[PDB]
Design a protein around this ligand. Sequence first.
Ligand SMILES: Nc1ncnc2c1ncn2[C@@H]1O[C@H](COS(=O)(=O)NC(=O)[C@@H](N)Cc2ccccc2)[C@@H](O)[C@H]1O
Ligand SMILES: [Mg+2]
Ligand SMILES: [Mg+2]
Ligand SMILES: [Mg+2]
Lengths: 167, 834, 243, 49, 48
Amino acid sequence: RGLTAGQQRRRTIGRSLALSGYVEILPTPFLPAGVFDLWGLEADDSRRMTTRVLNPLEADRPQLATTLLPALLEALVRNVSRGLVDVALFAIAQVVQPTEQTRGVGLIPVDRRPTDDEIAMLDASLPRQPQHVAAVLAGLREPRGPWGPGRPVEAADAFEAVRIIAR
Amino acid sequence: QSNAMRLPYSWLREVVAVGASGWDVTPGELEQTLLRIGHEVEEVIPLGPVDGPVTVGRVADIEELTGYKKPIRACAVDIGDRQYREIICGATNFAVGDLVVVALPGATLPGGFTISARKAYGRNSDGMICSAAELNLGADHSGILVLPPGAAEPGADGAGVLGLDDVVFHLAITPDRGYCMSVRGLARELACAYDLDFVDPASNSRPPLPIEGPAWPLTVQPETGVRRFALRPVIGIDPAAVSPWWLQRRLLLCGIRATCPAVDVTNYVMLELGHPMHAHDRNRISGTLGVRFARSGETAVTLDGIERKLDTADVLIVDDAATAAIGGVMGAASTEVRADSTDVLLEAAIWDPAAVSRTQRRLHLPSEAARRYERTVDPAISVAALDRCARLLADIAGGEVSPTLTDWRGDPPCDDWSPPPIRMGVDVPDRIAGVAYPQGTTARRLAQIGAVVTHDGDTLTVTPPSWRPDLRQPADLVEEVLRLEGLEVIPSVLPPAPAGRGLTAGQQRRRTIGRSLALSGYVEILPTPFLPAGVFDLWGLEADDSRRMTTRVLNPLEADRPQLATTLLPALLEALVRNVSRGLVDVALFAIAQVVQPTEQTRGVGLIPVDRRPTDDEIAMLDASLPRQPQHVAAVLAGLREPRGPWGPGRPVEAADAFEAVRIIARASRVDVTLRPAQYLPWHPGRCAQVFVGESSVGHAGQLHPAVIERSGLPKGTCAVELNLDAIPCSAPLPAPRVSPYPAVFQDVSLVVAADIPAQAVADAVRAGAGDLLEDIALFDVFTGPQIGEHRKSLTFALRFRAPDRTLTEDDASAARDAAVQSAAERVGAVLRG
Amino acid sequence: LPSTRVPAGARHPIIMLAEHVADTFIAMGWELAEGPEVETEQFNFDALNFPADHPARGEQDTFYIAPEDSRQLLRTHTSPVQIRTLLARELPVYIISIGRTFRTDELDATHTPIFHQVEGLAVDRGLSMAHLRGTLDAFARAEFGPSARTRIRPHFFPFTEPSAEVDVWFANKIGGAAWVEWGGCGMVHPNVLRATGIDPDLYSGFAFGMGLERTLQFRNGIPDMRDMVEGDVRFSLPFGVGA
Amino acid sequence: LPSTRVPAGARHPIIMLAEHVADTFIAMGWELAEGPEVETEQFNFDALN
Amino acid sequence: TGIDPDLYSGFAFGMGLERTLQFRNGIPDMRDMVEGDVRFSLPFGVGA
Ligand SMILES: Nc1ncnc2c1ncn2[C@@H]1O[C@H](COS(=O)(=O)NC(=O)[C@@H](N)Cc2ccccc2)[C@@H](O)[C@H]1O
Ligand SMILES: [Mg+2]
Ligand SMILES: [Mg+2]
Ligand SMILES: [Mg+2]
């Protein structure tokens, strides 16, 4: 039966943003250190409730991302620091959002098919992992040339990226 | 309408009921049964209906009302038991004593017209004398309905005598089932569908007339394709005799208007048995009847009084004086029967189907006989239909059927009319249908349609009947078994298809280009290939412009638009004009479609034999004969390219927008493109770019010529682009970029060149001198003014230098910049600005 | 505030339906064949077992190309792609073909002179009418949904034997819901296989040809195809960009 | 003169190769299955023997 | 998974996607394809 509706929509969104000047980033799930403190988020902000890795390659980055923006902003900083100051980046990736039902499940016997309830408790135990789409913009949205001086990035450009995704 | 077949259900039931007494089905069930076996029912026409006193009447007295501009009659009609009613009627086709159908006050005619006792022309009117159309019986003809004498008694029920409870079926018979162009064939199909015993209404036992000797001298040219020619005369009929009501009504319900019994029996037998019949005046034939081809420029006036320009391939019927009939198409007025005719010579002939088809299409005469001869007529029933027709004429208009008969059946005389026997495996229908039919299903079904079936192990020998020339191969027999068993019993199995390779590169590129242009605001047009009238004259193209060499259609729907498009722009501009005229003035349209470009090698190819695969050279000459049909991509723009809003006043369409559409297509095609100054109508000579991929031209873009825009009624400033996609080679690049992380050095350079030096040439020269350290170059300023000097312009580029293995120094970057400036100086004469 | 400086365009709904039909058959392992719009009589009629001087050929609504002895025409159907595919490829063959077709029919609610067809052709060992019905059921299921009413009845085409037509119950049909023809189909005629150098004793095949605009009318409930053929941007834009 | 007011972007080459691989298998009748990135040990190890 | 191994058999594979890209495009070092510099992606085209 080919691609599902959701798989097809992931392609259309990628094509639409790329044709609009956005460059895809494959975002790392390991959050930057202290990122939510830089954002000034409240202590009870749900984005702070993160799943943590016991053995990260960077000891100061064990928390898995509840939002795609920290990785995109980190990718934006890399490009800008390398002399590419007019960037529009996007990413289509899942995040990791644990709840109070997120827990470990003991070994289910593997000499038979797991029961329907065992399948249900295995799925319910994992943190929520919804697919997000995100983008960041900086510098000139329209470059300068023989037509004029260009146009800096403004909030309306982010609003139009919403309408690009919505269409 | 040449495939049409109209016949009333009451006639179908009668022929079927002979072999299956009491057979009767609802019109809805009959429609479904005909569809299940393959007969398209276009319309089901019920007669009437009629309510109230609609009674057969006898015109008793006619008093002419004088003084008016139209003849008006005050009639007294006997409606039964000599109870008279006064009727005012304006028709003239009746006299005292004729049988008419009157609608008395209180009756209801189709549809909803209630009759009331009124006073018209200063006289009493207790109803009206009905016509065939007002009764929903026959077609709208002139006058009122006059039943033939003795059809009914005055006082009989109108709906019963007229048979208004009958239902007429209009069928569209497929051209492979010419035998179904009659009551005989369709009644046989119903007997097959309902598993009934069928009695053929054309058989001998249904007795033959005696054969003492020839009926008329006849010479037949064998090359004319005639398979049979039969003639039997009927002498001494009554010219004043008319056809009975059952015969005239059945002709009426089949679309044929009755004239005289001599002609009515020829049409009645044609509808009943499927064999066309023609009636000649025996005393108007002068000498031996001859069947031969027409001569060069020979003429013939048919019975309608029209002169026909005959062809060498037309088969004729002639005697010693004039042409009597155009073979199998239409008879001439020479031997046509009239009120003077008393001796009738009936004709039953089987003509070649291809010859009749050629003649009737060229003379535009798709007569009732030509439609049937085109689809083959059963040659085994010629004398049988002749005897049936002769007995019927003598029974109606009196006379004696002469015991003489001419029966030309070829040389040597043909005595067996069955097509060759077909050998087919017994389970072959089962394999094609994917169904395990019960034992004997195939043999029983093939016998129902009239074939002799012998059995020998696993192979059936099937000999089709003479009325089924379409049964030539086992596949034909398969169709007969499956359609009668019903296609709905065939199961549904998805085939396991082998692993495919998906879309080709070109198919994928057509999608990417469509997505890219649509996302950029373009709306796709499916462009008509028929060029607007005079479009190249509006463009002012030269007479020898290759776009004028067009392929032309002989029969366009618009007589002034026969030329097929050599370019997509005329259709797109026409679509642009439609949108603008409807109030949508800011449009960007595009189209991805082929054009038609004939060359001097474009030509016709004669028929290649289809009993084998065409040779490689035959495939090559077939392909080389067709006009070139490359795929083009084109677009047009008008109005505001960017709309107005809270951001500003918007931006009108400019030539640069067309240039960017080229780069949208080029990026979607993954090819590099250069744009060069050019002059090419209908583009503006100063705002036109020719598009190259490498050194190959692929199209043009820019703003349209203002004179073309003016003459065409296009929006001002309209822009356009057209590229040849087949000239753009499919690219499959595998990039392997190496990204240097080392810091970049930013420097700008400002260069003065002559005003007509293209900016791309200055950038190429800068890039060529900068070397590998140059990562990016962007033009951001084009300046003219007294600071620069006349005939000059200043260009300023932003340069980004970067080393792959070290932090580039400001000096090392300036050395690359100096070399870039030196290169621009040598190649385009650029002067560093100071 | 509004933010769309570059208003969205739209690929044509007919083309977007063609993409959806193409993807449906590609997901089943089939491929897409192609053919020119201007065709010879050889491949449009003769190699498709059309007789020479016979109403099965003359009754066609054919755009004939000048001059009178050219034996060229605008193709009346996509069925000449059957001939081109069997000449160019080895067996087995499982293809569809989506392209424009031309007839002298005046524009009405369901007919237009320039329309598109979805051709299908499968030639292999042991294929039967059951495989044809399985393929059409998947075609109908993917475009009309699992609740679609279809019916198949006998018909005639020179290039099939047996032949059939498939109807779809068109609810939004002008004048009241009714069965409306969707396309023709049947088992590939042995004379067609003979004209392409294929042994009909070793290979059988089925083929179909459905209207693309007709499919769109059934799928979206569009009673009158005028808007989908006149090229007004207001018809395309509600369908989306189609990227 | 340059004309690109809206410079082209780019989907990631890894994602574009994935699309090409996906299309290759879909053209052979296969379909695409999915699964979360954070997994239980049950399905990542134990049920895989 | 509740499947009878006497009635059904199966095969499975697992290949690297980045590894495939390196073989296909001849990229010896995957650093650029994982660091997210726009200069790595843009030469590949929009991908629409
Ligand atoms: N004028 C028209 N406008 C729009 N759609 C049309 C028009 N004429 C035909 N069609 C559509 O095309 C379908 C097929 O049309 S058809 O003339 O009846 N049949 C054919 O053309 C055959 N070549 C189909 C076929 C039959 C057997 C095997 C392969 C293919 C119809 O069911 C309609 O849906
Ligand atoms: Mg039909
Ligand atoms: Mg047949
Ligand atoms: Mg014709």
